[model samples]
Target: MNIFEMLRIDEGLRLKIYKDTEGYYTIGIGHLLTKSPSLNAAKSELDKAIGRNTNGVITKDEAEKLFNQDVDAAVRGILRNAKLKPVYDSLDAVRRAAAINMVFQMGETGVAGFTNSLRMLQQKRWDEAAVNLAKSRWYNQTPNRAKRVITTFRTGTWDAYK
Candidate 1:
């Protein structure tokens, strides 16, 4: 199935959900141009992003919806900051997705709490950003996910992991 159908939504939307055992989820139109109409729209996008991978536990729309909601908390929080616009701008779509993945694991406030790191990112200091990124990554206990985010930040793409 295509991404939208896999998520069970029509197309051009975004969503956030949580799977019972697999953790949180975030699905969308894969762009910032358009927003999803509803939870179902988000789910449809999610299913597509998930592709054929079924290794993680948990299934069903309801559970996935919950997962996305949880992840959404993080995304919304991270986006709320008035500053850090420069740091956020440094990320491309892949890195943006990866950043959401990291924030999804780390509470939005928790991610935002990184003052020094944010400053480093704002300064365009890749080395400092990497260091800062590595330090606070412990919040989510997501080592690999954090690495991917940093990798894309340093390398300009998340393609290798994909």
Candidate 2:
């Protein structure tokens, strides 16, 4: 699946403040609650995610803005990471989006934990990559999400809805 599709399915489309499965206060599609916000450079991002002006009530448009902004940062992060950049750039759009999604979900350090999966992916070994991804602790933690991501990697299509 593409980035937005997978995020929409996995993260859910929520425009209101709510607690996630782990009970952390979150808003707008997996944005974890950040009670502390900086004023200088990060104030805008904090406002978008937390809505200090709107009193924590974010509209759909606001939510989309936050989501796109976060996704862009995640993509940039993938590009900035030295060891993963070449492999990320070499991947097709679908796979590239998946990689970005992984970064979004797991952060750069967490994505880096998938060493074998990244190796196989960089080598264009789809089957091996999928196998390696499926064997991870993340897969054990969330089987459905793992299966969905692996299926997209193997099939090069948005299979979650199907």
Candidate 3:
């Protein structure tokens, strides 16, 4: 067999589901299975994708690591958008992080709708951008997160709400 096909065959042969020595339900090589049947029932689509009855648990770190994979893609879109990239890159690290979070929360289309806010940010008019951000439907829907973003935009300081 070719080297690549041989490697794939070896991996395929290793796929199985069973309890580990530590008594954790495992599947597909050494992948640690996490199930929370009672937690939110249908809270996450991944729960169903992995198997609802598997009875597994994942730590916050594990969850975040998985989440970051998606977040990384969203950030790439924000940075690559012709209109958003210039403004996003001009901010300091703190504001840039907040912008990434905002982009994730609102999505590229939603953030692109923030015309006045984007203009203000591009022009370095921090306070105006903060005002425009606060006047959005997004702000009303998520007041706390909006406050943190607004504070960061206005003050150029990271005052993220906990």
Candidate 4:
């Protein structure tokens, strides 16, 4: 399965506004519309996506488009990381998917902070890799998502719910 198959279930395709766990305004399958900016800009983008002058909701197809673009960025960024590229290239599909999922959630630089964890993955130290990931604020922030990705890494299998 593609990364979207797994992430779509984890992220859930939300057509309307919902505050992320961090309380940032988010919408449409985790397309975070500028947490630091004005709320009106978020609304305006939503309006455009819905093809209307007004409406707080986006359609499934519009949301899908955004999710695809986000996935593309995540994949691109993860592969371009110097430290990660070798490890990513050596990994099995599920393990590689775990890396992409992490990037999708927090971007490449954010995931790069897990230096020890990343090194562990390169060595194929599955349990240590998972433990290092579990040690992060990200794991604390989103335990379920982190757990699933961690499991995928540890087992080198598709272990997530979605």
What range of 10 consecutive residues in model 3 has the weakest lDDT sum? 2-11
C-alpha lDDT values of all predictions: 0.50, 0.74, 0.59, 0.82
CA lDDT of 32 in candidate 3?
Answer: 33
Clash counts for all predictions: 15, 0, 4, 0
TM-score of candidate 2 relative to the true fold: 0.83
Best candidate (score: lDDT) = 4
TM-score of 3: 0.64
Write the residue-wise lDDT of candidate 2 on 1-162 in tens digits.
458767877888676666665555667877766433432223344465555765556777777777888888888888889988988987888888778767877778877688778888888899989988987777887788778778777767776546
Model 1 stretches with alpha carbons more than 4 Å out: 1-59, 83-86, 137-141
Q: Write the per-residue lDDT of candidate 3 for residues 65-96, one digit (tens) a residue.
A: 44455457667997789988888888776677
lDDT of 1 by residue, 1-162 (tens): 221222222112434343221233443322211144454554565455456433322245534554465556545665675654455666555545555555554445556667787676556676767777787636246465467567655565544355
TM-scores for candidates 1 onward, in order? 0.51, 0.83, 0.64, 0.89
Count steric clashes of candidate 2. 0
> Model 1 residue 70 lDDT?
51
Candidate 1, residue 27: Cα displacement in angstroms equals 17
Model 4 — TM-score against the truth?
0.89
Of candidates 3 and 1, the better by TM-score: 3
Error of 1 at 115 (Å): 1.6
Model 4 stretches with alpha carbons more than 4 Å out: 45-54
